[PDB]
């Protein structure tokens, strides 16, 4: 029962040349890593080396044109970096962004390999920039390549094509890119919880609604749990896991679990407006560990309150390491509406609901 950890300070180099206080801060990963050290979690883990993803690996999910353009930013002048970033929705680019994105994805590849070859049982990836908004052909929402999506396809490439991967995305935002890459796929189950507000919360698309259940062979294998009209917290996320995430996950029977673990639904995050506690995140993690013979990889996505993300992700690693889940209640009626809309939408596909 070994827990793996990947972290590389070089991922700090990606930065916003025109706003040094932009919330997607280099110090997000350094503060998380320092907290793991202070709580003596880092020393209990097997340290997994970071590496660069290759261009061929990026092609598992991304087009050659998208790869080529982000790769070209390594040599761009500031004016061109500013212009290129402005072509995307909510993106800033520095000369180091491309290599930092490659390191984020390659770090998760080595961790997935460590889990699947049996070097470790589960692992945590402290990485940036994030991934789950990136699409096959575009960058978006602070994301250049879809790290989680690439890790599922990489895991299949070193095992078998039909390896069953569950991606649970508990970042407060919908992972539009992850949904789209796998929308027609029945080997990768995508389950996202996210603030939605009738499509008015970023990324501002009705793609995130409960009635997007997948396409073709992928019908049933895309589960959107959208939140409306309420500051949601531990009881809503616990209830969503009880009624939706875990029954569906168990019937899918994943062989590997990836968590797109944004912590911008955490109490104290200005971008999320929610109040999931560190104890709540620990309970979510502990529930996922009952799947896939414990093969769970926790991947940092969003999360912008430096203290909140450090405490929340540390609680997740503590659960992975086997520590007892900490001690933690009527739901907002809006959350009941949301959960029951997902249940009605997915009853045709999941007999255990
Ligand atoms: O993925 C993320 N975090 O993990 C993420 C990605 C992109 C953005 C874009 N963005 C940046 C400032 C800002 C303000 C308001 C809205 C808004 O309200 N739109 O409706 C959006 C905004 C935010 C968060
Ligand atoms: K999400
Ligand atoms: K899918
Ligand atoms: Zn987010």
TrEMBL record:
Chain segments annotated as transmembrane: none
Top-level lineage group: Eukaryota
Annotated binding of Zn(2+), by residue: 171, 173, 264
Subcellular location: Cell projection, Axon; Cell projection, Dendrite; Cytoplasm, Cytoskeleton, Cilium basal body; Cytoplasm, Cytoskeleton, Microtubule organizing center, Centrosome
Family: Belongs to the histone deacetylase family. HD type 2 subfamily.
UniProt-recorded name of the protein: Protein deacetylase HDAC6
Naturally occurring in which organism (per UniProt): Danio rerio (Zebrafish)
Name of the gene this protein is made from: hdac6
């Amino acid at each position: 029962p070994i827990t793996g950890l990947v972290y590389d300070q070089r991922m700090m180099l990606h930065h916003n040349m025109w706003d040094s206080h932009h919330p997607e801060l280099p110090q997000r990963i350094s503060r998380i890593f320092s907290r793991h050290e202070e709580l003596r979690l880092l020393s209990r883990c097997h340290r997994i080396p970071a590496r660069l993803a290759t261009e061929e690996e990026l092609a598992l999910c991304h087009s050659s044109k998208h790869i080529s353009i982000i790769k070209s930013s390594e040599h761009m002048k500031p004016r061109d970096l500013n212009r290129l970033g402005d072509e995307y929705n909510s993106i800033f680019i520095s000369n180091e962004s491309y290599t930092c994105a490659l390191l984020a994805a390659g770090s998760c590849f080595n961790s997935a390999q460590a889990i699947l070859t049996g070097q470790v049982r589960n692992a945590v990836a402290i990485v940036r920039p994030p991934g789950h908004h990136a699409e096959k052909d575009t960058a978006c929402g602070f994301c250049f390549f879809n790290t989680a999506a690439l890790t599922a396809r990489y895991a299949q490439s070193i095992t078998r094509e039909s390896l069953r991967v569950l991606i649970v995305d508990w970042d407060v935002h919908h992972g539009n890119g992850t949904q789209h890459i796998f929308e027609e796929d029945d080997s990768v189950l995508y389950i996202s919880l996210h603030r939605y507000e009738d499509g008015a919360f970023f990324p501002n698309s009705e793609d995130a609604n409960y009635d997007k259940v997948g396409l073709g062979k992928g019908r049933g294998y895309n589960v959107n749990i959208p939140w409306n009209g309420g500051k949601m917290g531990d009881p809503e996320y616990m209830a969503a896991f009880h009624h939706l995430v875990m029954p569906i996950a168990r019937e899918f029977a994943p062989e590997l679990v990836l968590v797109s673990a944004g912590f911008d639904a955490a109490r104290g995050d200005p971008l999320g407006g929610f109040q999931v506690t560190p104890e709540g995140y620990a309970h979510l993690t502990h529930q996922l560990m009952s799947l896939a013979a414990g093969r769970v990889l926790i991947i940092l996505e969003g999360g912008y309150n430096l203290t909140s993300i450090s405490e929340s992700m540390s609680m997740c690693t503590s659960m992975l390491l086997g520590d007892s889940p900490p001690s933690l209640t009527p739901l907002k009626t809006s959350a009941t509406v949301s959960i029951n809309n997902v249940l009605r939408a997915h009853a045709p596909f999941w007999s255990s609901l």
